[PDB]
């Protein structure tokens, strides 16, 4: 696998620690659609909207299986720790027009 999952289910935005690498989900978009991080960094998505959202990486991208993240309710968060360099495209399962990528360098 190319990422580890600190928490399989979502957690409160507030519980996100100061200085976390946050991608906001707001205005029906991933507000940083192309994020560049380094190996070992944790990325945290935070849903700011009433509509639930997730992140979904198809099979072969983060590992063998698809990573279909849990739906974050408003003001919930979800993290992935990237362990290997690459470019990792994702979308929202419910709203597949919402697309982003994490470039791990
Ligand atoms: Cu979404």
UniProtKB/Swiss-Prot annotation:
UniProt entry keywords in alphabetical sequence: Copper, Electron transport, Metal-binding, Periplasm, Signal, Transport
Residues passing through the membrane, by range: none
GO cellular component, one term: periplasmic space
Major location (coarse): periplasm
Positions that bind Cu cation: 53, 92, 95, 98
Cofactor(s) listed: Cu cation
Pathway: One-carbon metabolism; methylamine degradation
Domain Plastocyanin-like: 1-105
Cellular location(s): Periplasm
Cofactor note: Binds 1 copper ion per subunit.
Single annotated GO MF: copper ion binding
Primary role: Primary acceptor of electrons from methylamine dehydrogenase. Passes those electrons on either a soluble cytochrome c or to pseudoazurin.
Protein name as it appears in the record: Amicyanin
Organism: Paracoccus denitrificans
Gene: mauC
Part of the whole protein covered: 27 to 131 of 131
């Amino acid at each position: 696998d190319k990422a580890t999952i600190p928490s399989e289910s979502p957690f409160a935005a507030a519980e996100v620690a100061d200085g976390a690498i946050v991608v906001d989900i707001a205005k029906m978009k991933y507000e940083t659609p192309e994020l560049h991080v380094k190996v070992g960094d944790t990325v945290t998505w935070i849903n700011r909207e009433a509509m639930p959202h997730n992140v979904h990486f198809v099979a072969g991208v983060l590992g063998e299986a698809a990573l279909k993240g849990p739906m974050m309710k408003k003001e919930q968060a979800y993290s992935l720790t990237f362990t290997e360099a690459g470019t990792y495209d994702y979308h929202c399962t419910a709203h597949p027009f919402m697309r982003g990528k994490v470039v791990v360098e």
